[PDB]
Amino acid sequence: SYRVAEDAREVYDENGNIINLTSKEFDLLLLFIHHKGHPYSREDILLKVWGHDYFGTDRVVDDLVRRLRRKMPELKVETIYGFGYRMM
């Protein structure tokens, strides 16, 4: 339902509306779309999006996912309760 330009870091919906993701939102999108079905824990996402020296709340991951899903409601992201997220 989306055209994802990984060079321009832009997303276009099926009608050609531009969807502007932040850099972390785009990184998260790439984790999902190239690994469909894979269960990502919150820590897994943190290490790949925030890096190796972040020790704060994992609720930043939940926030990032919600922002991505509000910007891209047709994405088949699913919450894995108590664990993390996957995209089908």
UniProtKB/Swiss-Prot annotation:
- PTM entry text: Phosphorylated by CssS.
* Highest taxon listed in the record's lineage: Bacteria
What organism, scientifically named, is this protein from?
Bacillus subtilis (strain 168)
Whole protein: which stretch is covered?
Answer: 136 to 223 of 225
Quote the protein name from its UniProt record: Transcriptional regulatory protein CssR
Q: DNA-binding region located at which positions?
A: 1-88
Gene name, per UniProt, is cssR
Subcellular localization is given as: Cytoplasm
Summarizing the function annotation, the protein's role is: Member of the two-component regulatory system CssS/CssR required to control the cellular response to secretion stress.
